[PDB]
Amino acid sequence: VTDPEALLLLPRLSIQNANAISSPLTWGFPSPGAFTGFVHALQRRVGISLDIELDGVGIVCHRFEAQISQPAGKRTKVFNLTRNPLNRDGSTAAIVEEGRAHLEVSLLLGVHGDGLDDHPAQEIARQVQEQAGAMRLAGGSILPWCNERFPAPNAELLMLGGSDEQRRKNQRRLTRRLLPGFALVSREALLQQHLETLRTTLPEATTLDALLDLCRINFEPWQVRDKPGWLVPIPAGYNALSPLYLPGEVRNARDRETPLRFVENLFGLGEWLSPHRVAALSDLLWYHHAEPDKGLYRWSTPRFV
Amino acid sequence: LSTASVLAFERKLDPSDALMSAGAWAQRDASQEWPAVTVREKSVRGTISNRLKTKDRDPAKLDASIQSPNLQTVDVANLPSDADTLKVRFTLRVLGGAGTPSACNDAAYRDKLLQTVATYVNDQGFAELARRYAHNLANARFLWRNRVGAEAVEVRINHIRQGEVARAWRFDALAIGLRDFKADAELDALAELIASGLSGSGHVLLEVVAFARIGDGQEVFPSQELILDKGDKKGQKSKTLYSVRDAAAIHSQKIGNALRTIDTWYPDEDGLGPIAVEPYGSVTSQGKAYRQPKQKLDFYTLLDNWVLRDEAPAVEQQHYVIANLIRGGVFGE
Amino acid sequence: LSTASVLAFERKLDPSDALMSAGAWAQRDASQEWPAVTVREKSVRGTISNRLKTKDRDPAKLDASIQSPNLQTVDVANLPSDADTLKVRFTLRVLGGAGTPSACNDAAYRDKLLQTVATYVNDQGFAELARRYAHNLANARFLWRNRVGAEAVEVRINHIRQGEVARAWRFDALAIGLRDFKADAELDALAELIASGLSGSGHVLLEVVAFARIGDGQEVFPSQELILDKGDKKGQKSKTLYSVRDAAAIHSQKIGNALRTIDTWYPDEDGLGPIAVEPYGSVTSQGKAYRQPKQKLDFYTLLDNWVLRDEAPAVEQQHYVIANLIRGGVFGE
RNA sequence: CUAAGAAAUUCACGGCGGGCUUGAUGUCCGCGUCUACCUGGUUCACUGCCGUAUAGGCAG
């Protein structure tokens, strides 16, 4: 929730073989938690060695093509799986199901540290890109450089200092390289507004999620209800049910040193936009805060409006 | 020292999806503006020629079933009629650091594992595995059925440090054998590059381009997608083909299958040939599972007997175990 | 020794899609810049010529039904009005290695199969099958209806080793019979080429070009595509034709049907003629299935009795079984 | 340290036979375009001259 001094931008990260399931109820473009957890992984691999601090992430999502199929003329979709090796015995196995995407996305970042005084901009951006080129971005690999290394130089922009003409100037210099993409934010105040509109009958929120992103055909005593934007249901956090456990209690943990709870996801509303609607690009990064006295987790972009 | 209940190794030697584009031979050095091979549909009127039983078989249904034509819609991919060369391009990263797991419960088991792998690397390098990987990049294993029946296959491999080319190799896939791993100077150079990559001594990104003379207007073989076949709605269409944005392609895990055919150390028969490295080393097409757990040559048995009990196996089985760690996977209970 | 539950043989003699381009006879040796035959639309008003049951056929219902519209839109392909020669070009690979399956469960059954096929090749060569294949390339079986009613049909066959021509053959399809397989010196040369190809002793790529005098502005016959009249609005077409990029064409499996008409060994009647090689040897147009499984001449019965039990059939039935292995298919359960 | 970590869909095929789309016709009436201008880009940091080595009487 701390405002960054710089906005590091990764130009064209093309994921091969992503994870297009992302939740038990929504389907397509993956969770914000992969894109924030990637940034915390960069914080665990770079930011302690270059004395910087990476907090948020800005989804731009230039391109998206899911490996789907629609045979038999039905208006529903199925998947395109892969094989597995043979049985333990040597006959065949069962078939689990897994989503898939050929994603391409650009990522804004946020820098807090003192490495700008110790190192120039091209050094910082070059080290961050040349560490992010060997990772896996959303459950799938990151495609390396090709003939399309021509947008591959990064950018970096100090946000506090300088005159306002350099702020709007270099800000519009940033938003001409995020130009075909569509940003993504979180808009739960709209969901509270629609709860207060549909509060005549029942104030339930999950049925509001079922009654936002759909084509409401309201007949005449037929009129399609006007959608006030390109809204989308996303997963937006965890709401842990179990009390917390000591480290050496639950068998089959990942490591026996950090505590555990059993969680479920928490469904929220989000919105795809053009990047030119945004007032300041620092009001776009995805943070996630917590209060583990209770089970209340969420990803958010606080102060967007 | 029990085994860790959670083990997971991220893969190294990460390939990409290979793209296919067709053109003319001896226009081969300018293979940069060649158009892609597209996947199209055609209909097929065949007859029913499978096996038919004798139990619950009314001969009216039998002779009514044989004497009638079958209709069906498939996907094919062919070269253009004025082109006789298939071009297959993909890239390959060599990551390195092939001993550290990504998830492990125990801390003593993980330190014992790192001492075992570091003992292996300090006793002998990655020269054997990178030599066999260099032989699988040398010929055209990743041209699965496209290689079969070709006049000349040429493989070009580039090493990339920047927006440049550091060193280029040009091979001949038909002269290099399919089953005989024979040494060469250039294969020792590229094996030093891959072996320098897996040890973590640098960054290795390779660009692999393959060329095959097939014929004018012949058929190429991309990889085939799943129609799930869950009960109802079999559908008019059959044999759908994988693709990218208006180009036929091969999956990445199939090229990754073609790169890791190392294992010439079966207990059963070393006369057939190297088939790829798996725990419970199995072949899905042949329906057989070599390297049974009733023997003592399985990956889990050798790994348990070599980490926990310090019973070092033979050297070639150690090459097998480290090959499974370069493969990566989900291990443990 | 039970049968393998999975068997699959990849095909040999792989053709391509034939292209049609029209021009003038005696401008025949320069047939390289001839324009293609395009597929166009025209409208057709139908009639009533179907059978009636005369259970709901009143004499007023006929006049009411020929008041009715039978309006329709079809595709035709014609020669240009100043050209009287059809040119049909395709290529053909001969792969070889016609005994090894691509998928098999058992290892003993596969070795017994390879000993059986190698016993067949060592007892007698591929001279018979390549002689009949040479006769089907000699005449113009692959001109299905385009051959019917023509003045002169000329077939030119080229052998290709590089960007060159090794040996060229020029035949006359009307002098060579449709049903009588008579020997010739040139057909023995080309049969030695194909028989040298199927045995795996080299690489064989052939270029086949066919020439037919039909007439000025007459109609050519490409292969017809699949459409399904379901419930949409305002109607649609009733006859589409297969095409490539702005040229009429024939499917590859129809030429492949025309090449493998070998079977003169029916139990029923050898007076009709050779119709193509199928398990449960059947004709879709005639609606009949020769070579019934109630007899002992089916492919599955002869293959089971000749691999598992060493009961060798007659020599011509062995030519039938090896012809089905050159065809390829999905065998087993 | 990312609903984390892993994965070969394969083999074969003939869409094809036949057809009459016809018949008839008025596109009509009317109109204000106008005032003003320095191409000299370099329509090539130049086009032909004692030395294939940078030295020049040039039409400049």
Question: Mind giving me the DSSP string for C317-333?
Answer: HHHHHHHHHHH-EEE--
What counts of helices (H) and strands (E) characterise chain C?
7, 15
Positions of strand D less than 7 angstroms from a protein CB: 1-21
What counts of helices (H) and strands (E) characterise chain B?
7, 15
Q: Which residues contact C101 (CB under 8 A, 6 or more apart)?
A: C7, C8, C9, C110, C113
**Dihedral pair phi/psi, residue C319, rounded to 5°:** -65, -35
To which residue do tokens 């055609």 refer? B42
Alpha carbons A175 and C64: distance in angstroms, whole number: 70
Q: What is the dihedral of CA A190, A194, A199, A200, to 10 degrees?
A: 150
- What CA–CA distances, in Å, run from B185 to A161, B1, B182? 58, 45, 10
Beta strand ranges found along B126-259 (DSSP E): 153-159, 168-170, 204-213, 243-244, 247-250
Count of C-beta atoms within a 10 Å radius of residue A105: 25
Alpha carbons B292 and B301: distance in angstroms, whole number: 10
Q: Are residues A160 and A201 in the same domain?
A: no
Alpha carbons B20 and B209: distance in angstroms, whole number: 10
Q: Is B235 in contact with A251 (Cβ distance < 8 A)?
A: no
Report yes or no: B209 at the A interface, CB cutoff 8 Å: no
Residue A27 DSSP one-character state: -
Count of alpha carbons within 13 angstroms of residue C62, beta-carbon side:
11
The burial class, CB within 10 Å (0-12 / 13-18 / 19+), for C218 is middle
Q: Which of A181, A212, A241 is the last residue of a domain?
A: A181
Q: In B139-239, where does DSSP find H-type helix? A: 185-198
Beta strand ranges found along chain A (DSSP E): 9-16, 58-59, 68-69, 78-79, 102-108, 141-142, 183-186, 217-218, 223-224, 231-238, 265-273, 287-290, 297-300
Alpha carbons B101 and B119: distance in angstroms, whole number: 16
Split into its structural domains, chain A has a count of 2
**What are B296's two structure tokens?**
């003592």
Alpha carbons A260 and A240: distance in angstroms, whole number: 10
Q: Is B282 in contact with A253 (Cβ distance < 8 A)?
A: no
Evaluate if the CB of B80 falls below 7 Å from strand D: no
Residue type, B246: D
Q: Which of A123, A147, A181 is the last residue of a domain?
A: A181
Q: Is B282 in contact with A90 (Cβ distance < 8 A)?
A: yes
Identify whether the C-beta of residue B93 lies closer than 8 Å to the C-beta of residue A145. Answer: no
Q: Which of A155, A181, A207 is the last residue of a domain?
A: A181
Alpha carbons A223 and A233: distance in angstroms, whole number: 24
The burial class, CB within 10 Å (0-12 / 13-18 / 19+), for B255 is buried
B/e letters for C122-156, b = 16+ CB within 10 Å, e = fewer, are eeeebebbbbbbbbbbbbbbbbeebbeebeebbbb
**What are B80's two structure tokens?**
């253009």
Q: Chain C contacts of B219, Cβ < 8 Å?
A: 14, 16, 252
Identify whether the C-beta of residue A108 lies closer than 8 Å to the C-beta of residue A9. Answer: yes
CA-nearest of A252, A125, A215, A229 to A183 is: A229
- For chain C, which residues lie within 8 Å of any Cβ of chain B, measuring from their own Cβ? 6, 10, 14, 16-17, 19, 90-91, 93, 95-96, 102-105, 107, 163, 203, 205, 207, 225-226, 228, 242, 244-245, 251-253, 278-280, 282, 284, 287-289, 293, 300, 329-333
Identify whether the C-beta of residue C214 lies closer than 8 Å to the C-beta of residue C84. Answer: yes
Alpha carbons C97 and C121: distance in angstroms, whole number: 11
Q: How many Å lie between the alpha carbon of B162 and the closest alpha carbon of chain A?
A: 9
To which residue do tokens 């081969």 refer? B28
CA-nearest of B324, B240, B289, B323 to A93 is: B289
In this structure, is the dihedral angle defined by the CA atoms of residues A33, A36, A39 and A43, taken in order, positive or negative?
Answer: negative
Q: Are residues A158 and A28 in the same domain?
A: yes
Residue C4 DSSP one-character state: P
Residue B223's nearest nucleotide, by CA–C1', is: D9
Domain that holds residue A21: 4-181
Q: Are residues A172 and A260 in the same domain?
A: no
Identify whether the C-beta of residue A154 lies closer than 8 Å to the C-beta of residue B101. Answer: no
Q: Which of C16, C300, C330 sits opposite B78 (nearest CB)?
A: C16
To which residue do tokens 């029990």 refer? B2
Q: Are residues A121 and A261 in the same domain?
A: no
Strand D proximal residues, A:51-90, Cβ < 7 Å = 82-85
CA-nearest of C47, C20, C54 to C34 is: C20
Q: Are residues A285 and A175 in the same domain?
A: no
Q: B152: nearest CA in chain C?
A: C162
Number of residues that this document lists for chain A: 305
Count of C-beta atoms within a 10 Å radius of residue B53: 8
Q: Are residues A168 and A53 in the same domain?
A: yes
- Experimentally, how was this structure solved? cryo-EM
Residue C43's nearest nucleotide, by CA–C1', is: D21
CA of C37 to C1' of D14 (A): 21
Strand D proximal residues, B:198-227, Cβ < 7 Å = 221, 223-227
Instruction: Return the SS3 of A77.
Output: coil
Q: Is C16 in contact with B81 (Cβ distance < 8 A)?
A: yes
Count of C-beta atoms within a 10 Å radius of residue C314: 11
CA of C291 to C1' of D24 (A): 65
The burial class, CB within 10 Å (0-12 / 13-18 / 19+), for B20 is buried
Identify whether the C-beta of residue B106 lies closer than 8 Å to the C-beta of residue B4. Answer: yes
Alpha carbons B246 and A298: distance in angstroms, whole number: 39
Q: Are residues A171 and A206 in the same domain?
A: no
**What are B35's two structure tokens?**
């158009």
CA of B101 to C1' of D6 (A): 13
Element (H or E) spanning B91, and its range? strand B85-94
Q: Are residues A20 and A39 in the same domain?
A: yes
Q: Report long-range pairs for C138-141 (Cβ below 8 Å, ≥24 apart).
A: C138/C171, C138/C173, C138/C176, C138/C187, C138/C190, C139/C171, C139/C173, C139/C174, C139/C176, C139/C177, C139/C178, C140/C173, C140/C210, C140/C212, C141/C258, C141/C259, C141/C261
- What CA–CA distances, in Å, run from B105 to A243, A249, A250, B108, B304? 22, 13, 11, 9, 16
Q: Which of C104, C163, C242 sits opposite B286 (nearest CB)?
A: C104
Instruction: Return the SS3 of A132.
Output: helix
Q: Chain B contacts of A86, Cβ < 8 Å?
A: 280, 282-284, 287, 289
CA-nearest of C198, C22, C66 to C126 is: C198
Q: Are residues A132 and A35 in the same domain?
A: yes
Identify whether the C-beta of residue A65 lies closer than 8 Å to the C-beta of residue A129. Answer: no
In this structure, is the dihedral angle defined by the CA atoms of residues A231, A233, A234 and A238, taken in order, positive or negative?
Answer: positive
Number of residues that this document lists for chain C: 333
- Identify any residues that bridge with B32 across adjacent strands, giving them in sequence order: none
**Dihedral pair phi/psi, residue B195, rounded to 5°:** -65, -30
Alpha carbons A268 and A25: distance in angstroms, whole number: 11
**What are A182's two structure tokens?**
């569509």
Q: What is the dihedral of CA B293, B296, B298, B301, to 10 degrees?
A: 100
Count of C-beta atoms within a 10 Å radius of residue A202: 10
CA-nearest of A177, A109, A104 to A141 is: A104
B/e letters for B78-89, b = 16+ CB within 10 Å, e = fewer, are bbbbebbbbbbb
In this structure, is the dihedral angle defined by the CA atoms of residues A251, A256, A262 and A267, taken in order, positive or negative?
Answer: negative
Q: Which residues contact C18 (CB under 8 A, 6 or more apart)?
A: C88, C89, C90, C142, C249, C250, C252, C255
Q: Are residues A164 and A200 in the same domain?
A: no
Beta strand ranges found along chain C (DSSP E): 7-9, 14-15, 18-23, 40-45, 71-76, 85-94, 103-104, 153-159, 168-170, 204-213, 243-244, 247-250, 282-283, 288-289, 329-331
Q: Are residues A77 and A152 in the same domain?
A: yes
Alpha carbons B82 and B76: distance in angstroms, whole number: 18
**Dihedral pair phi/psi, residue A5, rounded to 5°:** -85, -35
Instruction: Return the SS3 of A116.
Output: helix
Alpha carbons B217 and B238: distance in angstroms, whole number: 22
Residue B56 DSSP one-character state: T
Q: Are residues A252 and A272 in the same domain?
A: yes
